Design a binder for this molecule. Structure first.
Ligand SMILES: CC(C)C[C@H](N[C@H]1CC[C@H](n2cc(-c3ccc(Oc4ccccc4)cc3)c3c(N)ncnc32)CC1)C(=O)N(C)C
Length: 447
């Protein structure tokens, strides 16, 4: 026997779904991918429900202030999002002390501006919790209520939990290779060299994006082999692949991203006004996604601002990872022009076709420059031959205006001519994540 409790509002979208509002009764039979075999016994309608819409009985996932599955950096971003107030907070699983917890609180001071402070919540050997030894609690709820009444040493009195939206409903079960008829293409988002992108509706009920590859551009078996790897690369900073139409012309169905590519966004009224620390946060988000790709021994092959997507809430999500590998070179694709852009591509990839995570690192440096210049072409004023010959002689794009020197230093490391001398994405992720909070305490040492 195993019991769970609902969290959000969701009713049937498919056939054998259930209905619940503001948390109802659930009895999970056994698990699956993202859907769980649910037993209601209250509405007595039985079938499947989204596993991320429910919470286990005994645990903290029911609490409005608890955020399971998120990182320290995630916590900082979520709290600093517009809509949160001074003292907004969350409790999360500790990233550096397994089994214990961390409290993250939105702070403000005139010197540093908007910040997030983190506190270690220690667990007592025989039960209960504390941040400061003089103030212990039987439960985390008691801890929260205590610091809601006064700061008692914290940077701020706790106000309200960090804001959050209901999670995206999981993709339809066993709907990986889907019929073309399941898709209504509603709005063309852009033409492209080897395919178009559409906003579309899947089976009348779900908004998606569809990349529609041009005839002749890919074959079914080669694409599917790769797509079956792509779909497993799941990470908050990679765009999610939902489904594919595995008949020519091949369709790739993904989550829809409201603000288009990062290049589009940086060139828009809204995006051109993002301040430098937000640009650096975008850079960090992408580095986090590329560190994941690196950890998974994968290769992007075409990293650039046009292949980063931006969500309605300004989350960056890497797109087109691995796609270049399965675009065919034949008479049909040749008429669409150059396959990869010289100005973004590492010299060893151009010269010897050596595409690796290190050639992605080179490209990431070019992408950093795109970001800090709000989408300017790389190497302005230079032709492609000029770029290649300049690079061979140690020329690199000079530091532009409004670019922190340490960000430029990261670019220069990415652009080492020898791939082995380029940093890892793990390294880049660390430096960008900590860009402004370097030489600071991880946690606040409360009295
Ligand atoms: C101002 C724009 C009109 C200019 C336009 N910009 C584009 C930028 C990109 C936009 N674009 C592209 C995608 C996208 C969809 C599927 C996909 O498939 C894969 C995903 C992962 C791994 C493998 C394949 C990749 C990207 C996408 C999206 N899911 N949601 C919103 N916009 C999107 C569509 C608009 C452009 O570049 N043109 C050449 C016209």
């Amino acid at each position: 026997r195993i019991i769970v409790v609902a969290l959000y509002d969701y009713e049937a979208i498919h056939h054998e779904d259930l209905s619940f509002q503001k948390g109802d009764q659930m009895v999970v039979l056994e698990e699956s991918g993202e859907w769980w075999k649910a037993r209601s016994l209250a509405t007595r309608k039985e079938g499947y429900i989204p596993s991320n819409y429910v919470a286990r009985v005994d645990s903290l996932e029911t609490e409005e202030w608890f955020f399971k599955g998120i990182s320290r950096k995630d916590a900082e971003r979520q709290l600093l999002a517009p809509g949160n107030m001074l003292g907004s907070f969350m409790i999360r699983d500790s990233e550096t002390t397994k089994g214990s917890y961390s409290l993250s609180v939105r702070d403000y001071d005139p010197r540093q501006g908007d910040t997030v402070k983190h506190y270690k919540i220690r667990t007592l050997d025989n039960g209960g919790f504390y941040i400061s030894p003089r103030s212990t609690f039987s439960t985390l709820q008691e801890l929260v209520d205590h610091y809601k009444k006064g700061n008692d040493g914290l940077c701020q009195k706790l106000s309200v939990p960090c804001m959050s939206s209901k999670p995206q409903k999981p993709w339809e079960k066993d709907a990986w290779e889907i019929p073309r008829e399941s898709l209504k293409l509603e709005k063309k988002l852009g033409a492209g060299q080897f395919g178009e992108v559409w906003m579309a509706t899947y089976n009348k009920h779900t908004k998606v994006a569809v990349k529609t590859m041009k005839p002749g551009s890919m074959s079914v078996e080669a694409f599917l082999a790769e797509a079956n790897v792509m779909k497993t690369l799941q990470h908050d900073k990679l765009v999610k692949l939902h489904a594919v139409v595995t008949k020519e012309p091949i369709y790739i169905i993904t989550e829809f991203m409201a603000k288009g590519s990062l290049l589009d966004f940086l060139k828009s009224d809204e995006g051109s006004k993002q301040p430098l620390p937000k640009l650096i946060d975008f850079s960090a988000q992408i580095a986090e996604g590329m560190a994941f790709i690196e950890q998974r021994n994968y290769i992007h092959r075409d990293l650039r601002a046009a292949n980063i997507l931006v969500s309605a809430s300004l989350v960056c999500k890497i797109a087109d990872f691995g796609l270049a590998r399965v675009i065919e070179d034949n008479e049909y694709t040749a008429r669409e022009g150059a396959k990869f852009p010289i100005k973004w591509t590492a010299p060893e990839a151009i010269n010897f076709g050596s595409f690796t995570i290190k050639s992605d690192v080179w490209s990431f440096g070019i992408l950093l420059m795109e970001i800090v210049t709000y989408g300017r072409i790389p190497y302005p004023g230079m032709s492609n031959p000029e770029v290649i010959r300049a690079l061979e002689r140690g020329y690199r794009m000079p530091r532009p205006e409004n670019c922190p020197e340490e960000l430029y230093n990261i670019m220069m490391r990415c652009w080492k001519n020898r791939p082995e001398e380029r940093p890892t994405f793990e390294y880049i992720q660390s430096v960008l994540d900590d860009f402004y909070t370097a030489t600071e305490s991880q946690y606040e040492e409360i009295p």
